[PDB]
RNA sequence: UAGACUAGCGUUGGAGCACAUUGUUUCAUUCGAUAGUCCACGCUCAAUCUUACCAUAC
RNA sequence: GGAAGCUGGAAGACGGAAUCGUUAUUAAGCGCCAGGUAGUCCUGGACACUGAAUCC
RNA sequence: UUUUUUUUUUUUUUU
RNA sequence: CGUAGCUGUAGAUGAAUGCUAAUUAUAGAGUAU
RNA sequence: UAUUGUGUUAGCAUGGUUUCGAGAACA
RNA sequence: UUUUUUUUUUUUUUUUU
């Protein structure tokens, strides 16, 4: 899903309105997260590297009174970060 | 007779039944759900230890009447409701 | 292994390679932090702008050093939660072992004042 | 008031990360070891199962 | 360490760690 | 704080009730389908768009050297998918060293 | 099975005026029910003071060295009045105090002369309450922001692993 | 006659009181460190009366299948009779309990 | 037989110096820093000047001086009765070495800056 | 010298509980002993209610399927059996969703498990003539 | 159909009081008054449950 | 054919816990009586809680 | 409550009489810790070394 | 080991 | 590891270790001579 | 994730479980 | 390696103003 999304969104800049005459080559290479700084990802935390990647580890209770719990409000934040900090 | 359970992914969620008080058949919890929902708090994403703590005050202040809201350090029952709302907006 | 022949020919990749100094990043953080926490930042505002203890009437209140009194004593007492506001009247010497609370208690004292006045005379004055 | 930078956040800013799986970050041999607990469904989590060390 | 057996053990133990404690009585 | 809490027996007045009304509903919804296809839907209805603009994207790689291919997540995937529709497409003498493709 | 605290076996802060807590001929309390704090009652007072002037040359030298010094020594007073009771002067004067509702603890006492002075100063003390009300509004705005909390990072949070980034 | 149903203990006021202090200490555990930090920085030793009723030492061992507050271990969490009945009912065999050895 | 240090001639109370050749136990460390207080105070640049009287050489040998030195030295070798087996006391020279080097105290042998080390 | 006969002596008398490879067992038994009584009391009761009304039992199930999915996927003609109701009970043990592919409960997508109508090997096997506690509803009687 | 689970220890106790209710003689008015509000109705048929 | 004998060796003092006589508004309800379900009893540890007791009051 | 420095003229060389029992890595000495969920015993539990004699 | 050492021993382990 | 072996002192008629103006450590609190 | 009163007369001579003290197990 | 969101007593729970 995350490979197709990047590719599909990139075709918009390649469709004609042989060579590109080196004028609009950077346009297609600017709308992707690879060659983009990670400083604007969160205005409340201006830093280079703050966010990591989420894991695929199963979570939750097999059967109990708390089946529909999942992750807590505060737990979801650390699930998408490399590691917790104490700068906030 | 019984409400549906459309959880995420699966088709059964015991958490919503307990907080709503439909399965446990606990009158104190049934009246608590209609009260917090009107205040605008996300009760569905609350801890198990905190839901019972608030429910105890609702029943205690009902049978004996709203005349003993005393708490340690001079705390009012309204402060807890406001504080919890911020942590659980809607 | 890094090739410098590609980053020089493209501006998009140059930004990623460039590492802004901490000074530039810290400047932006201050603005964002203040905007979010607009209603926070000051804790102790009963600084000397009004000097603590009392400011309206000070000196010779309850120090049992001479006959009669000179002036009264009024100030505010912080509540246990730090949100409520109530006045204060009682002041023995600095510690204030006894507090008269807000005017709710002082009102009853005036009503009971004539009752005690007529009782103390016939209580033990004549014996 | 003061707004200092924590040491943990400082390290994050200064870190040359790789650009995709085919790029070698380090330039020396290194072995990574970690203990993973596997077994029947336990009612409680087993502690002391999050160690990670590197040898060279 | 109330008796002379356990109490003297503490003094002897410290003597092997690079300390000198008087011994003498008890 | 969490060490002392682990004592005594748990509560007994919070068990699941054996209600017949909820039993029938569970059985009825047990045979539901799984029409998720979250990943397949994204790929589907996408190959046609590339085929329409096949000539437009043909010149993209001609003006870009192999050394410039630094962003593989967006470029390597695009090149691989493009070759699926057109197995034969010799653009120039240089080619991948059997590593990136 | 020893005691919990050793502070109860010591004399606390001096009360200035000494009054016998257990009453013998006390009247009946009135009012002071809704408040349930600081009940009003009448009792008998007993003033006491010490003037170190009539002491002998032997004991006066040591007493002054402990009282008028950089720091207090032996509480800045002699032991029990085994021989100094001759110079002790005490005058009986009716007084009153307040006690806690449930705790039943003595707070403080006031002399009869000081009680009458309060009545004469009623006009002077009543007007002083108006000044406090003026600052009530000013302090409300400054004391409300006295709560330090961490900056909220979530912002109704995104799932920003790689995608979404074009969505932003 | 009929040995007790070991899953559900009988009523006991003293047993319930011990668990009450556990919840109070957990919430106040954060405040305990703050009181020690302020005194350490200033360099003055003073008492903390507030910790008397919410202290960690107020709680002590108790028998779950019981209500006595003596003769309870941290491994079994049961009294003399609690372990005897549990072991004789055939419940510890799965957990590696061989009574053959002394 | 009854040697000090045991079979392995242990020494968990002495600290070596990088410069010159001189070692002393932790007992003498307290006296050295207190005696050389004038140099330390002047190095940095009343409540601050509280230990001035303790700098006297004769006062340390009196009854009052003997108690002051013992108060600071808590005898780290002595501990609780339950500290048995693997839970045994280690060499406390790690903390002493840091303070002795940061305070910039001169060595009695040769006047030098921070040159002490664990040993 | 017996080496194998004296194995484990070191970690019996000269080792701490928190500094050894031995794991606690009380935690697992806490949630295991309680669940046994739940299945015993509610076991026969659930089956009795299911068998109370023999005929017309499948009508309720058929109508319920028309509201959840709408189209009856398991529809069959009048000359074919619909289904067989199995008395199941809910799960009370708070098991963790482990990532073990060989587990029997990690892949559970429902809060109900089958119950054995008959067992030949009782789990709570006594070591003597003693009975199981809580298995005597009727009070006793004495000759008097 | 509803069937609320109850403590097994309470089941045997319920029958003990009910057995001697209409069979044997029970002394004291308070025992009958308080005993006629806990074991007189089935746990599943109660209006309120703790 | 045990105890009885033949070796070794711990005691009529000063000290720790406990039973008991004498104090107590409260000084922990108690076992067993003479070869012992008797003295660290269900004290595998009492400086608050463990504590059942008395005082005080809601 | 535990331990330590200093100080030291607390009460004891009485009795070869008598009562408690050991089936030998027994008896007699000496040394170490595991639990008792802060410290907190001379008892109980538990390991190791020297290890004699008699008619039992 | 004739340019070698410079010395007491424990209660799980070289699988 | 303790009594070691070995080896200096007095081949002890005088080695008893409790009493306490005073400090070491745990603990929220164990204080006054 | 606490939740169905009583730590009170009455156990040797009517008691369920456990156990101390004395006696016994052979063809 | 990076220094600031606003602010009136000798009378900082000890002094005859």
PDB file of C-alpha atoms in Angstrom, chain A residues 36-43 47, chain G residues 168:
ATOM      1  CA  UNK A  36      12.497  15.778   2.082  1.00  0.00           C
ATOM      2  CA  UNK A  37      13.569  16.962   5.549  1.00  0.00           C
ATOM      3  CA  UNK A  38      11.670  15.565   8.545  1.00  0.00           C
ATOM      4  CA  UNK A  39      11.591  18.933  10.370  1.00  0.00           C
ATOM      5  CA  UNK A  40       8.137  20.053   9.155  1.00  0.00           C
ATOM      6  CA  UNK A  41       6.454  16.735  10.162  1.00  0.00           C
ATOM      7  CA  UNK A  42       5.327  18.307  13.478  1.00  0.00           C
ATOM      8  CA  UNK A  43       5.329  22.083  14.208  1.00  0.00           C
ATOM      9  CA  UNK A  47      13.701  18.451  15.114  1.00  0.00           C
TER      10      UNK A  47
ATOM     11  CA  UNK G 168      -0.138  16.684   4.251  1.00  0.00           C
TER      12      UNK G 168
END
